[PDB]
């Protein structure tokens, strides 16, 4: 079966940029390639068919090119409505495989996260589970890494991270990072730390508390 | 052998025109050549193989429709063309339709619709061409004599064991000399390009079946037909007529699939031979050939023997065949070198006289095994008569 | 007029890679985009037409996709014969503008340049001009920077760099860097240095001579 | 005024019923309404503007061909389809051609070629539809009296100076009443949808020119025609017939452009009105209308005055007009309020009896300037008659 | 060779008149001469080149107008001539037009306009004359015998190989003796000035294309025509009729370009040969000649050889040609000095009697290479028959 590789899963762009989305077929597919865009909650919409033909109603900003194994969708003068997921698909032979997708997001000035740490609530500590929450809010770019420590020792198991979609007004991202452990383990340690690595600081932002302090 | 029960029988009396006897062969039947100069030789056609076929046109048994869309320009207006009219691969039909007033535009007069639908075939049927070149034949032939009647139908000794040679005949070689070891060799000349009447027959495949079709049938049929030369993606001709885009009388123009036709082509084909195939090649069965059989060198292997002693028994008892010949099995317990077996169809006994043709030629049991079998067959006269075997007081 | 932007002017690829070449139109061009490849000394050859249709004879490795403003040529299972310049072109309206081109070259293992420095020849020094030559030979990748110094001071004016095409057998590049100055200035200084920055070393390769030494 | 020299003249003298006179107007000519008791009113059509047109079909004046390619499958196949047959936009013609042996393949009888070429139009000609709605007219009208004969043709003030008025008439308003200040208002009713015989005329544009075309011409013409409703990219019908793919007894099938036709359409159009346009809207000129002119309220702009004293002179001398009317300029140096001017066409001398119709109605010079001009015109008889102006001994 | 697949075939039986056989040649077809006295020679015409043409008249496909101006002298006063009437190069038409009164001058009956416009042609079409002198021909000819069937169509050698020869024929030399090395030389006499019917055909060029035209067409056509003898600057004749200066009933006389005609000339030319060129000499292709072929000296090179041993195995299998001839490739593995190749079309098998004409003359494979090919062709009788090659038991 043919593999269609979109190596760039995420692209950050400014309005007005020339956006280049690449699709590489694992074998020669001629010109049998379509491009779609998809927005959340909707079915995909066809942009380009048979490599280089623009579908009716699609803005002339979109152009497909290429043949053989290498295909390109170019968006000239990118507009905010072009933020979407983009997929290629081949029709040379079954199965009619899709590329992995490229999600186009918008660039803005870098912004450091605002980080806040929350010990387990008294109500959760009746349960035998304990969650320590860090919110990392209103940052850009999306790339960020959170490292949790308990009494100096890194903890990787039990960490759950959730990200908001890029905000429609301020173009930032926010993230919750939640360390869940047993209540018994939580009460055997004092120091809890979440460390955020982000390009806006040469060293991570550190939020930490001592459980028994006020 | 390769004869008897076949029930479509042709006897050809010959040994005149220096074995110039000419014979026709039909996959149904077989002709036996009886010539005093020869042991009686049984010819039968088996399978006519065709190989190195090429594809010509093709069709769509089962249509499938995908995306129906339409637009209309109101009142007189070059039917607004959808984008779908530029890709081919889409049926489109431009019709006239009333759009009155609240249809959105003045002059609720007659406007125009253009409806289009993607058209993608399902399954297919692909004709194939058969050319007289790369045409083969297979003729198996055998010689009565007396081999074991249980061997009447077998294909293990196709290349060995008494009379039984498999002859190929293909264009670039009308002739093959079949060497039946010890009987000499039967000169055989056949016209491959003439008989079967090819070049008028396209070889045709529905799903997992086969046929033959006279041209001016398969060339003219009303279905979508791929151009046949390129398998990359179908770019159809036709593409209507398996899809009926029809309308009522309001604002709509609908479109229908037609639910394949695969039942039609079958019920359409009549008087078309069935056919089967193994891969790149395929095996018809309907025989026709004109073979001029050269009987020149045939050496009876049953001459210059004694007469097998007395000790003949019937096994399975005699029987009648079809056109009236009789077959006999005889097991000679006589322990002797390969020896000649006397047989005569006698009218009474007032004077043991030969009556009626004995056609096995000269039955000669070849074994040292002291118990052997020989199947000799003969056609006695119309009235009551005896079949007699042996010349000793132990004759049966 | 419409601008077709191919933002990647150079791409390095291995045989077998999925190559993605992107073309972005400055306004919506529908599917009116062609893709060509061109080899040195030849006219371009059409690969894909109207965004997504592969031209006859083109290997099925080439597929065009996209519509609107964003077009992609994908080369699946890239072969060495696919090394070439690739161009998109739009046919939505005059002028029928081309993208800027993407040159596909082949990847190999990194290789440090072999650097050699040559003072002006005695014969050139009769002329009143003086050229100091550095050859930087058999390196990979192509990206390299040369800085010239005279008695410790960088000199930028009068430097001419020339690169060979990627070698057809060994896949390396070579470069000549020539510093030209007046003979009078050349004989007023002693130290001449060419420094080559390249990814194969954490600090540049330095070749230097003292004019009056042997 | 807006009359005299025009040379296509219609006098209408039947002011019977309550000013019910009905008149036809032709962009070439003008009709003057002369009715006893009512000043003589000059009507002329000027320009019939058409606006809010829509496009219908279109054509290709100049064909252009791009990439010619072909392939052939050799005898016994189908016509191997190029990829170029799947994109439309390419002409293709499948023909039969001999490929004998060193043409590369056995079977020297007849193969098939498929040649294809990209087809891209150059320039174009786009019909447009004209509907009776959004149809306009322009009728300028003026009243003889005596205004300055130099003002006979002017537009700078078609709503103030003299008694000129520019009347519009468009479907949703068959009637327009032109208020000529002080003469009252001429009731005017016209049938816009009837006269000009539209709905049968498509409005047609070659390069930078215009025409009109009876339908069943522009609907049927043999050139490539765009569907007309979408301007994004042409997806043609036809395609052929501006491109002739032709061959010669050989391996070749060639293709020709035909070098536009733009000269044909011109030389083809005959009996088609010329037309011009100033953008979205366009101005024909061929007049037809049926206007029932209501003469009801017209006040005599020359009653209850004295007779202008004696001091009349000719300026430029009289002249004859066309159908036989005579015009006169007279400059009354008499310094008086706006006053009536006596004029009589008398055959003879002494007892000056009125002879022949005086059609200016009542010439009244309106100025205090002490030097004024009035152009009055009148139709005398055949016999040597006098034109007379004045009542005093100073009459000329 | 230079034959077979061509499908327009003429066989010309031998001539007992001493190689006096006379033959016609048509660029479409070819005639093969079969004469027992000769090896069978294949003649075909290829290209008839015309050189040293001269220009006659010319025309203007596309008119262009420049500066329109006019003046009028009012009633009594000839048509005031613009300066533009003295330069030629300007169309001018003097018409009658009403200037009434405020048109500036008394006498409202009819004046005169003179309108003029510079007239400068765009593109052109220039006839050229073709004279029987400086007319050429090209006849390629080849001889069947033994030769790699793959060489049936080639030009690389036209001056070498087996015997092909490229013969020129031009007026001042009706004859050329083509020396085919070792076969002797075919005496060839042709009437160049007669056959093609020239002197009635002007050679004609639109933009980058070509034709032929019977005179009394190109001599009479209604377009502006340059005098053709001088290229310095056009001083036209005609110059109307590609420009229509027209005007309605007013003060105006307008002028129109007509938008070339280039589409007309094409659609006008019908039944006109299209001829390509390459600079100064144009190559038509339509054949006609009367060639009396002198077969006098033709030496069969296949006499006084042995018969090539046994090792004959067909290739490409045989095939049927057009008028019914058959071609055969045979690769004689058996290697010797050039050895004659036995071939007989036999109506039987046993005793092989010659049946039907063998027309390759005497096939002789010339190589020492031990593996060679020879393409011999022959026309067997109507009924079924064998093609036979060889004399040894190994014959196929």
Author numbering:
A (entry chain G), C (entry chain I): 1 to 214
B (entry chain A), D (entry chain C), E (entry chain E): 1 to 396
Can you provide the manuscript's text about this entry?
Zika virus (ZIKV) is a member of the Flaviviridae family of positive-stranded RNA viruses, which includes well-known human pathogens such as dengue (DENV), yellow fever (YFV), West Nile (WNV) and Japanese encephalitis (JEV) viruses. The nucleocapsid complex is enclosed within an icosahedral shell formed by 180 copies of each of the envelope (‘E', ∼500 residues) and membrane (‘M', ∼75 residues) glycoproteins. A recent study identified a human monoclonal antibody (mAb), ZIKV-117, that was demonstrated to possess therapeutic potential, with no cross-reactivity to other flaviviruses. The mAb ZIKV-117 neutralizes ZIKV strains that belong to African, Asian and American lineages and is able to reduce fetal infection and death in mice.
